[PDB]
Design a protein around this ligand. Structure first.
Ligand SMILES: [N+]
Ligand SMILES: [N+]
Ligand SMILES: [N+]
Ligand SMILES: [N+]
Lengths: 121, 121, 121, 121
């Protein structure tokens, strides 16, 4: 993949969170995510996909379900965005966080936000 | 997983699209997605995660990168939502679709929408 | 405005909420919104804008701050969408609900959802 | 309103755009928005609402329909967010931009993004 080498590795967001990803030649993303905010402790599995054949950014997305051996926040976040390489490489994303709720509370089950990931803290 | 059996199988959205998923005991989602709208032909790989231990819905998300052996739309969609079981089982989602763009066009790179998936067409 | 007459009046969403709007020739929307869900009782002021000169839908949006003489939920919702006329007229929207929070909690301050409004309940 | 004086005036986003707003004691926002990106030239009317009685930010939102005497982009943007006062005052927002489309293209009618407004450029 064009940006396979650029994506693989460790990324940090504006809040302190870290994620470590391997991009496969087949478009796969696999790794772990460690949050700095919210009901999250330690690492969580992440999986996703990217465009392996894009001047344009490389579109990608991934999911974390917020369950590991220390916490279950009954929720999942998806990040959708694009990787931009270079000396100031970035993964710029928007995200959706859905919490498991009763049907009566489903209208308020999904938060939206944005994260910018860089190679340095 | 509590809803592993409920999630695994074939789901249809309000637009005609189909997706087929296997939920693993470990929280993994793997399968294929076939769209009915947009720049999409045939099946695309999908991967995601769900809460394996939630009255509450089961939070989940998944990603499709819109590249296969017939099309490359240089884009990825993530769906975030919850599975609700029963006779009228549903996966209710919001989604984010990011297109790879130049930096100048990044402000207009992400679409948002919603899909409701059911077990019958 | 092309759809001024079509927009002006009373609309109902899928949850029971009601809103009453006047569309001005100048692109203004003014009216009241009464919710069926959440921390809301009675009517709230709404204001917005629409495209007065669009086969295409008419783009529009409006805001409600959730403060009236009975409740203050320290929050505001914006709806963005389009009006489609005809025998089955609809206003199809996505919405963002932001709650006032401390800076530490700002990452979780905005909910996202969707509402479909029709002329009949 | 607690933050009426703090909100009233001129704000600049990260892209260069400017908006000038008057906050009324009754929760009204009125003013003009001038974009730096997209199909926009000169000023457009904006209207919105804010929480006049919130440590917490002040929730607010507003709408711009992208029609003036120079351009009609057949679209409207809503911003939802919160005002935070102080020496580094900010209005932090998410936004939804809906374009008028045919029914067949409605699934791709709404863009999502974020803007941070400050009192200095
Ligand atoms: N965010
Ligand atoms: N949608
Ligand atoms: N919703
Ligand atoms: N954005």
């Amino acid at each position: 993949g064009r940006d396979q080498a650029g994506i693989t590795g460790t990324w940090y967001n504006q809040l302190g969170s870290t994620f470590i990803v391997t991009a496969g030649a087949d478009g796969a993303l696999t790794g772990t995510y460690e949050s700095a905010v919210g009901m999250a402790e330690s690492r969580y599995v992440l999986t996703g996909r990217y465009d392996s054949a894009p001047g344009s950014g490389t579109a990608l997305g991934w999911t974390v379900a917020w369950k590991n051996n220390y916490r279950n926040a009954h929720s999942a976040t998806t990040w959708s965005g694009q990787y931009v390489g270079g000396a100031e490489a970035r993964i710029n994303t928007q995200w959706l966080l859905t919490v498991g709720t009763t049907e009566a509370n489903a209208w308020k089950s999904t938060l939206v936000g944005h994260d910018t990931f860089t190679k340095v803290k």
